[PDB]
Scaffold this motif. Structure first.
Motif, PDB file in Angstrom:
ATOM      1  N   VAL A 181       0.926  -1.270   0.032  1.00 40.84           N
ATOM      2  CA  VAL A 181      -0.080  -0.075  -0.073  1.00 40.84           C
ATOM      3  C   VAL A 181       1.027   1.258   0.102  1.00 40.84           C
ATOM      4  N   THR A 182       0.955   1.809  -1.164  1.00 40.03           N
ATOM      5  CA  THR A 182       1.893   2.950  -1.265  1.00 40.03           C
ATOM      6  C   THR A 182       0.979   4.498  -1.291  1.00 40.03           C
ATOM      7  N   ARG A 183       1.428   5.477  -0.498  1.00 34.93           N
ATOM      8  CA  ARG A 183       0.788   6.643  -0.323  1.00 34.93           C
ATOM      9  C   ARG A 183       1.839   7.810  -1.009  1.00 34.93           C
ATOM     10  N   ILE A 201       4.935   9.002  -1.791  1.00 33.43           N
ATOM     11  CA  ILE A 201       6.448   8.711  -1.632  1.00 33.43           C
ATOM     12  C   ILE A 201       6.693   7.570  -0.861  1.00 33.43           C
ATOM     13  N   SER A 202       5.895   7.435   0.264  1.00 34.25           N
ATOM     14  CA  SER A 202       6.543   6.333   1.049  1.00 34.25           C
ATOM     15  C   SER A 202       5.590   4.870   1.006  1.00 34.25           C
ATOM     16  N   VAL A 203       5.997   3.953   1.195  1.00 31.51           N
ATOM     17  CA  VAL A 203       5.291   2.643   1.228  1.00 31.51           C
ATOM     18  C   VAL A 203       4.671   2.326   2.665  1.00 31.51           C
ATOM     19  N   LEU A 204       3.363   2.346   2.960  1.00 30.04           N
ATOM     20  CA  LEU A 204       2.939   2.603   4.321  1.00 30.04           C
ATOM     21  C   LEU A 204       2.697   0.938   5.096  1.00 30.04           C
ATOM     22  N   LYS A 205       2.280   0.017   4.042  1.00 30.29           N
ATOM     23  CA  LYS A 205       1.841  -1.301   4.533  1.00 30.29           C
ATOM     24  C   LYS A 205       2.667  -2.255   3.983  1.00 30.29           C
ATOM     25  N   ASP A 206       3.388  -3.272   4.245  1.00 28.53           N
ATOM     26  CA  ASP A 206       3.954  -4.524   3.586  1.00 28.53           C
ATOM     27  C   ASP A 206       3.019  -5.744   3.479  1.00 28.53           C
ATOM     28  N   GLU A 221      -8.670   3.338  -7.243  1.00 30.75           N
ATOM     29  CA  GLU A 221      -8.533   4.317  -6.560  1.00 30.75           C
ATOM     30  C   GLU A 221      -8.266   4.167  -5.239  1.00 30.75           C
ATOM     31  N   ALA A 222      -8.030   5.298  -4.395  1.00 35.07           N
ATOM     32  CA  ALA A 222      -7.454   5.235  -3.083  1.00 35.07           C
ATOM     33  C   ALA A 222      -8.307   4.637  -2.008  1.00 35.07           C
ATOM     34  N   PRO A 266       8.820  -2.076 -12.749  1.00 32.26           N
ATOM     35  CA  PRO A 266       9.378  -1.340 -12.189  1.00 32.26           C
ATOM     36  C   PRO A 266       8.895  -0.754 -10.552  1.00 32.26           C
ATOM     37  N   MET A 267       7.827  -1.381 -10.572  1.00 30.17           N
ATOM     38  CA  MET A 267       7.183  -1.053  -9.017  1.00 30.17           C
ATOM     39  C   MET A 267       7.467  -2.413  -8.039  1.00 30.17           C
ATOM     40  N   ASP A 268       7.925  -1.865  -6.947  1.00 32.44           N
ATOM     41  CA  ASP A 268       8.141  -2.934  -5.813  1.00 32.44           C
ATOM     42  C   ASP A 268       6.566  -3.118  -5.379  1.00 32.44           C
ATOM     43  N   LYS A 290       5.923  -5.558  -3.115  1.00 26.74           N
ATOM     44  CA  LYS A 290       6.151  -6.197  -1.829  1.00 26.74           C
ATOM     45  C   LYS A 290       5.633  -7.496  -1.565  1.00 26.74           C
TER      46      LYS A 290
END
Lengths: 198, 204, 233, 222, 212, 222, 196, 196, 198
Positions: I21-23, I25-30, I49-50, I173-175, I177
């Motif tokens: 879960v990405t917000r 700039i940061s990855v919030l949950k793995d 969507e979010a 290109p996306m991590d 997780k």
């Protein structure tokens, strides 16, 4: 972007550089040395615009291998730095501006000290204990602030480097496919190819 | 976005009794991220001092450039360049690039060695010379510094006093400024001695 | 979210020892065309208030009927409609001011600058301004749109601060107001030579002058002006 | 297009004392580059020992003052002439401002009076009703020319005890209403000089347990 | 702005900065970035100043209303889903908030929900939010055990906020600390970042590139 | 900025205020807007601070070299034509709005030059942000054939109008009187209406207030 | 602006207002919109004051030099030098000009150069902002071969109207009479032309 | 369009062209721009044909109903019903209208309703696209209390000009004479009004 | 976006779902279970969507747990599908449209067959052997085309799934997780929590 790191210790300078090359949708290469050797004891890592990146670093490589060959003297890091800077500052009010960010790190054979310089595509230059371009800095600068001593052995500093990369793999959305770590010291430029599992 | 404020920083200059002071913060940052806390904005050329705020790669370029220009004035003119003169060289020199300016906010400060008269002046990025008896300010805290100076200033301060005054104007503006701080330095310039103190301030 | 069409230019006014004065030319203009030449932009309410209006003339005529309407209402069931409980400036203002701000806040403003001038029940001078946004303010001297720029500086040379008001005779205020109207016609391109001026004294009541003219203009010197630098003939 | 907002300028400052509070504003009301009035007050007595100022766009602040002055008339009728706790008017103003959250009162707005304990209080507001209680806050155009100076001469910031090297902070004192008035009218005479939107007049409302007092001082008219 | 919250053996730590800026200008550093909702629940202001204060204040009401009507304490899960739902109701009307709702209940244990303007609701162990979010994450991520002495883990929040205040121009001022136990929350002071930086440079040996 | 020019019987006089504004802030409370082109040809600068200076320094230099080739006193009408044609070469991108006046062997002259290259000849002229305040005074008090002292009162009166009634202008009043017979007189700060009343306090800090980290002496000459 | 030029029995007459406005403000209310490029060849300026001034200035020269070498310039030539500047530079100019003059052969000659850069020879021509309102009055009240004072009157009335209706026009009414006997400058003040 | 109305000794006369253009094309060259809202109260339409038509249609009603109940409508009233529609609907209309009529008390009455929605009573009024060109001719050639054929002529000339100079105006010239003795419709053809 | 996969075999349906879960700039949950259980034998994975994402899936969960409880009958997959579709098609010309993409997979207890449905935020519904939303499809559909038999054991199909995820980790290109793999069969909905190393 595109991960450009570097930390200057006691006896050397260390540069990390993401291995990945991405063209919009696909990851094209998983093994990119994002650095040109400017001379025996001076290294430059770089990231930024697509083609603009390499074409610049190689122009500098040429021009420094030429001053080396001409005066049979290894141009000092401070100078290679202040030259690279001017070359960027020149291109910022030019027609199409080099859009490139760089880290220059090398051993000043005359002061027997290591030096790390940070220069952005605008020609903004400052000397640092540690540095980074792109967003690389946000996740890692908080760790360096905390764990950095300037008397750190080259080994003590590789450890602290792995810890940054780990944080970047955790809280950073991009899959940058690893780093290549290079070290610059009295003996020159060598590359540690045992890193993502040291 | 705005060039005149990506990097940050402020510079301030005042006059006293037969003396002058110029001071700045040591901050250099890309937008929100602070990068260096050892980036001084004040350079000297002989006995004439020049502080420059604004865009780093232009603050740096103009230092590199006025060294060059003034070094040749010394050799060609047989003397060190005067403050009144150097001022007029910064004007014409900045206005050279009128339609593609250096995004800077220079402050000249120093003492005319023949007349012993204190001298300060500041410019806009295209060279308008604001000469002023009292004080000159410049930076991302253009406003805050004007506020402090207008209150804390009296003319003819003795030097050891004018250090306290200029330090407090700088310090307290940069603390109300997001893009300034991270250290500070303050040159006090007597007719022949020049003292450079670094300051203690918050680091946020 | 409208836009003006037929407009009228500056309204100017100052207060003095006993009453207040307000004036405004008789021209409504279609863009750059000085189209309508008989417009009255001073609206009397009672004989203690004059309301001056610059801006969109259609929205002015609406505001005029709102007051003719508001005077009709006041009289209803009220034996003192022509005395004690009759219409006061301070009311007429707070009403229009309330409307203007309501209208801006429905994003359909009345496109005007309004100056309410007059005398109160108790002899007090009353002068206040309100515009299409709802903004309200009061100074010893007020003018709207274009007059705010040239008319004020001349009038404030008579009444700079409040202590100056009692010292200001009536013939002085009128002389200074008429001057400003002349100057407005030298330099305002959307101006008429014909204007109306109203005085509201706490003694003489409402004195409303229609069909005035800017007199004693100085243009003799234009004869001596030739060319634009080099030219001699 | 039609643009429902303005700037009328001016500059307000509110300071919380120990047994008092002051709430000061300039008297100049402008539009762009012209002057509208040299006297048109910015700071208002609302009763129940609460003074407030809604600064920025006059029409919106004038209207918000009206609307709260009225919220008081009705907290009376509705709760048997009870006094409006400073802290409670603050919260009621949050609900007033946030009512028009999606078409706000374009005002930085400050109130001052006494808290239920007798000590001085000042509250500051967004245009959308974020509120916090403050020691001293300035709002308005010249906010930036005042605060640094106040931080230094009121909260003694960056000031140390002489000859203690830099280890002992200059000890915070508390100031007579007469001293705060000194700093206020020097904060303003300063600003007036370097801001073109400040000048003309300075009006201060002062709240003590004894009620509300008005002091008025002239300012440069350029 | 920098706000952070995390779970551990002894409950929840919440830590915030207090700087609030209007561009380059710092308008106040006296901002309560932690919202005392009711004595058992905390929210963290981050995003829109008013939008947070207000709807979490409102939440506090809808929470009391819920305890009177059911004679039993409202669960973090449902406290947060009321706010998440009210906020999703105003999607893209221009609301701006990014907040951690924190609570410790009989039935759920220490529990943290991250709730934002978008309508997102996320249960987690570690959340930092704001401009200096990345800096906090860095310090938290490297030095976070679960069984942390309530005193060591209160220091960790004190410091993950410091890392951020330093770098970020838009964070700084002072640090507010809160500890959340099953019995409720306990304030842990307001430590000014000015003085705190120096205190930590000495005792930690860190911030080595800051000449002082 | 407020600047004006006024022709009288045996000469011409030009006046200006002293306030330079970057946005809403006042950077120089006293920069002279009165520029010298030739000994007896001066002009008043309004617009981009730098451009009125630069384009004056220039035309004045060229005009100096020309009075030397020609062995002749420099004429107002020269400085006009060279300024006119320079500004126009530059499609208005040079932000100078000038009142150019002086005395040459042909009499008294008074002209105004706008940035796009237009010129106006007249007996009274005003330019800049207070242009309208000043022109209102001028239009009310100017008769044909003034006297030296009348024409000075009038231009200074017209600059005041600007100072007060305009947020763009302020502080002092510069004058220059170019009589046909005599030398030119430049009266800097001919009027000083805006003097800052003595502060309420004095903020001279007790020595030692400021915390110092490191101290050292730099070397000035080699 | 608001300008016109009329031919008659004895020559040609030029007329103009005197109001240059930037915005709603009358920056100068006494402008000399009648500009001289030769003894008896003048122009009427309208459009950018900075453009019409620069051009007339540059024509005054071309013609001073043409006089030096080749002699006295036909009224036709003055017009050609104006067109050549306005047309070949259309992209960067906003100027509408009326060239008028008297030689002995043709007497009254008048050339109007619209914005395009086109050139049109005519018996009379009106131009400038406030012309729109008198296309009516003029076409109805103009005659060929008028007497001197007949033509002054025709101009005084035509321009009295233009100024009444136009906000971008006004001031005094300037005329310049071009005949064999010489150059006569006229001026009529507001107290006079409004009462018509 | 291109329309006007004039009052005189015996009543009021309405005049107009007949050219509605969409673009450069004359979609109808015989338009009846003189529209009737009551026995002796007519209007002149200009602006959107669709807007002026809809309005007059809706006024014709309001007045037919006013007649039913309350009696014969003052010319003044017709105007008020027009203003009320035009003003209270300004945001969505483009119409400029001239209302003119004859009662016995006042005889000739004329009200012009510009775009705003304002209302202006006048002796005569011109409007429509091609009016701009005759503000000059009309102010000079109009007189109060003219004779019937004096006024027909005044209109024929004024409108002969407007059409000469306007491309958005033309066709035939329609008139409508409103007097005690009744309603008389006029028409003048191009072969006639051009030769003036 | 955000990896949503699914493949229907012989005896079941398998759903993969990125854990991240990405917000910005940061990855919030793995560790995000991007799926709500709609009923014993019907699962729905989702991305888009979010906030719109979860809020929808839960609305559907409720409405299906309600038809289950009311008629004490487990609504068939075909039907749950054609309902979810209509609920999206309804919201596409609505004021603010649900911007959500979904994979519905479940066991039709009456045909004893597995079924996989693919529905995009527009209401576009089709039944498939395998499917994916976002860009997930480009790297993986080429492999499925090739290696897919419809008689594949549930084990044979997990293998082929790991092979797709591996390709996504290589050329994407996306991590993201990792994934969470869930399986739906006659016995219901179970989750394999030993995947990124099976």
């Amino acid at each position: 972007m595109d991960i450009i790191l570097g930390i200057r210790v006691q006896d050397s300078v260390i540069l990390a550089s993401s291995k990945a090359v991405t063209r919009g949708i696909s990851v094209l290469k998983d093994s990119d040395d994002k650095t040109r050797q400017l001379s025996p004891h001076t290294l430059m890592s770089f990231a930024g615009e697509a083609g603009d990146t390499v074409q610049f670093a190689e122009y500098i490589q040429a021009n420094i291998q030429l001053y080396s060959i001409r005066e049979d003297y290894e141009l000092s890091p401070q100078a290679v730095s202040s030259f690279v800077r001017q070359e960027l500052a020149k291109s910022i009010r030019s027609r199409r501006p080099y859009q490139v960010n760089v880290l220059i790190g090398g051993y000043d054979k005359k002061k027997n000290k290591p030096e790390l310089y940070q220069i952005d595509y605008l020609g903004t230059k400052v000397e640092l204990p540690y540095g980074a371009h792109g967003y690389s800095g946000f996740y890692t600068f908080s760790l360096l602030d905390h764990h950095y001593r300037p008397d750190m052995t080259t080994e003590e500093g590789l450890d602290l480097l792995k810890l940054c990369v780990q944080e970047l793999e955790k809280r950073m959305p991009m899959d940058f496919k690893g780093v290549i770590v290079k070290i610059v010291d009295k003996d020159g430029i060598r590359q540690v190819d045992d890193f993502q599992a040291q | 976005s705005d060039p005149s404020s990506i990097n940050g920083g402020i510079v301030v200059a005042m006059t006293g009794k037969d003396c002058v002071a110029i001071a700045c913060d040591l901050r250099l940052g890309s937008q929100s991220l602070g990068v260096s806390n050892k980036f001084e904005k004040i350079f000297h050329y002989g006995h004439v001092f020049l502080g420059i705020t604004g865009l780093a790669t232009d603050v740096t370029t103009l230092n590199e450039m006025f060294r060059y220009k003034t070094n040749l004035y010394k050799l060609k003119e047989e003397r060190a360049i005067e403050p009144e003169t150097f001022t007029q060289l910064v004007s014409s020199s900045l206005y050279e690039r009128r339609f593609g300016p250096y995004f800077v906010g220079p402050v000249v400060a120093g003492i005319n060695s023949k007349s012993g008269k204190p001298f300060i002046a500041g410019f806009d990025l295209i060279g308008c010379i604001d000469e002023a008896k009292d004080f000159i300010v410049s930076g991302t805290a253009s406003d805050q510094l004007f506020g402090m100076c207008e209150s804390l200033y009296e003319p003819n301060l003795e030097p050891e006093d004018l250090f306290e005054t200029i330090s407090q104007a700088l310090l307290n503006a940069a603390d109300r400024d997001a893009l300034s701080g991270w250290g500070a330095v303050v040159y006090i310039i007597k007719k022949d001695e020049v003292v450079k103190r670094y300051l203690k301030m918050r680091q946020d | 979210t409208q836009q003006p069409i037929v407009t009228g230019t500056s309204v100017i006014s100052m207060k003095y020892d006993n009453g207040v004065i307000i004036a405004a030319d008789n021209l409504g203009s279609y863009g750059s065309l000085l189209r309508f030449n008989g417009v009255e932009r001073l609206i009397p309410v009672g004989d203690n208030t004059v309301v001056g209006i610059s801006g969109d003339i259609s929205d002015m005529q609406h505001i005029e009927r709102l007051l003719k309407d508001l005077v009709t209402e006041n009289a209803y069931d009220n034996p003192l409609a022509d005395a004690e409980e009759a219409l006061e400036p301070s009311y007429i203002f707070e009403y229009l001011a309330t409307v203007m701000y309501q209208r801006r806040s429905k994003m359909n403003p009345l496109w005007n600058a309004i100056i309410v001038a007059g005398v109160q029940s108790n002899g007090d001078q009353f002068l206040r301004y309100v515009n299409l946004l709802g903004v309200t303010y009061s100074s010893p001297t007020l003018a709207t749109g274009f007059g705010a720029h040239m008319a004020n500086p001349l009038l404030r040379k008579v009444v700079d601060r409040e202590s100056d008001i009692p010292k200001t005779t009536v013939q002085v205020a009128e002389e200074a107001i008429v001057n400003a109207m002349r100057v407005l016609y030298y330099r305002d391109a959307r101006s008429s030579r014909n204007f109306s001026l109203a005085i509201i004294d706490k003694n003489t009541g409402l004195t409303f002058k229609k069909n005035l003219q800017v007199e004693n203009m100085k243009w003799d010197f234009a004869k001596d002006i030739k060319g634009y630098g080099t030219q001699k003939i | 297009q039609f643009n429902p907002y303005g700037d009328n300028g001016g500059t307000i400052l509110g300071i919380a004392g120990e047994d008092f509070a002051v709430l000061a504003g300039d008297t100049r009301n402008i539009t762009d580059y012209s002057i509208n009035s040299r006297y048109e007050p910015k700071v208002f007595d609302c009763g129940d020992n609460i003074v407030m100022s809604a600064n920025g766009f006059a029409a919106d602040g004038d209207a918000l003052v009206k609307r709260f002055k009225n919220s008081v008339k009705w907290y009376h009728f509705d709760h048997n002439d009870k006094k409006l706790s400073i802290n409670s008017a603050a919260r009621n103003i949050q609900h007033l401002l946030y009512g028009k959250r999606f078409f706000p009162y374009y005002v930085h707005t400050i109130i001052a009076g006494l808290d239920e304990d007798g000590k001085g209080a000042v509250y500051s507001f967004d245009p959308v009703g974020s509120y916090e209680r403050e020691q001293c806050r300035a709002g308005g155009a010249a906010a930036s020319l005042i605060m640094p100076f106040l931080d230094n001469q009121v909260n003694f910031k960056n000031q140390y005890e002489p000859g203690t090297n830099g280890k002992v902070k200059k000890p915070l004192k508390y100031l007579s209403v007469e001293e705060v008035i000194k700093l206020v009218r020097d904060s303003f005479t300063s600003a007036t000089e370097r801001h073109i939107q400040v000048g003309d007049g300075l009006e201060i409302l002062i709240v003590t347990k004894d009620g509300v007092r008005k002091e008025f001082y002239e300012l440069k008219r350029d | 702005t920098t706000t952070l919250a995390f779970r551990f053996q002894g409950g929840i730590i919440v830590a915030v900065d207090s700087r609030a800026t209007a561009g380059n200008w710092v308008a106040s550093q006296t901002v309560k970035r932690v919202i005392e909702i009711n004595p058992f629940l905390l929210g963290t202001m981050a995003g829109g100043a008013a939008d947070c204060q207000f709807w979490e204040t409102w939440l506090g009401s809808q929470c009391r209303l819920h305890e009177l009507r059911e004679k039993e304490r409202i669960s973090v899960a449902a406290a947060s889903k009321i706010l998440s739902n009210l906020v999703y109701q105003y999607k893209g009307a221009g609301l701006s908030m990014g907040t951690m709702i924190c609570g410790y209940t009989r039935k759920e244990g220490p529990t943290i929900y991250y709730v934002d303007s978008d309508g997102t609701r996320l249960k987690g162990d570690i959340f930092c939010v704001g401009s200096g979010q990345t800096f906090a994450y860095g310090v938290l991520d490297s030095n976070y055990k679960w069984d942390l002495s309530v005193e060591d883990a209160l220091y960790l929040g004190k410091r993950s906020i410091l890392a951020a205040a330093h770098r970020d121009a838009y964070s700084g001022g002072s640090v507010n600390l809160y500890h959340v136990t099953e019995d409720g929350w306990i304030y842990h002071g307001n430590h000014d970042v000015g003085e705190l930086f120096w205190k930590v440079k000495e005792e930690e040996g860190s911030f080595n590139n800051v000449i002082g | 900025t407020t600047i004006v020019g006024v022709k009288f019987n045996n000469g011409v006089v030009i006046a200006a205020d002293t306030r330079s504004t970057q946005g809403p802030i006042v950077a120089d409370k006293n920069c002279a807007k009165l520029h010298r082109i030739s000994p007896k040809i001066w002009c008043a600068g309004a617009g981009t601070a730098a451009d009125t200076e630069a384009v004056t320094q220039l035309i004045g230099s060229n005009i100096e070299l020309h009075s030397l080739y020609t062995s002749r006193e420099p004429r107002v009408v020269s400085a006009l034509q060279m300024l006119k044609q320079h500004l126009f070469k530059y499609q208005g991108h040079i932000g100078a709005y000038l009142i150019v006046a002086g005395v040459d062997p042909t009499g008294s002259h008074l002209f105004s030059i706008h940035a796009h290259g237009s010129t106006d000849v007249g007996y009274y002229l005003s330019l800049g942000s207070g242009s309208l305040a000043a022109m209102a005074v001028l239009e009310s008090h100017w008769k044909q054939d003034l006297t030296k002292e009348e024409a000075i009162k009038l231009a200074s009166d017209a600059i005041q109008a600007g100072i007060w009634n305009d947020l763009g202008s302020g502080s002092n009043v510069d004058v220059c009187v170019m009589e046909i017979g005599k030398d030119a007189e430049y009266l800097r700060n001919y009027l000083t209406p805006n003097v800052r009343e003595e502060k309420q306090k004095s903020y001279k800090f007790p020595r030692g207030t400021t915390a110092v980290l490191k101290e050292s002496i730099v070397n000035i000459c080699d | 602006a608001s300008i016109m030029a009329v031919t008659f029995k004895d020559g040609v007459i030029l007329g103009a207002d005197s109001r240059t406005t930037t915005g709603a403000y009358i920056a100068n209310r006494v402008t000399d919109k009648l500009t001289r490029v030769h003894d008896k060849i003048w122009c009427c300026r309208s459009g950018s004051a900075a453009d019409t001034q620069a051009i007339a200035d540059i024509v005054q020269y071309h013609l001073e030099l043409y006089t030096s070498q080749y002699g006295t310039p036909s009224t036709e030539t003055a017009a050609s030098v104006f067109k050549e500047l306005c047309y070949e530079n259309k992209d960067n100019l906003t100027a509408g000009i009326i060239v008028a003059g008297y030689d002995d052969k043709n007497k009254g000659e008048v050339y109007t150069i619209p914005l395009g850069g086109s050139v049109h020879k005519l018996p009379y021509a009106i131009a400038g902002s406030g012309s729109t309102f008198i296309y009516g009055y003029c076409d109805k009240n103009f005659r060929e071969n008028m007497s001197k004072e007949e033509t002054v009157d025709f101009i005084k009335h035509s321009l009295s109207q233009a100024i009444k209706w136009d906000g971008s026009s006004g001031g005094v009414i300037r005329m310049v009479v071009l005949t064999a006997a010489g150059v006569e400058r006229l001026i009529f003040y507001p107290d006079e032309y409004e009462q018509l």
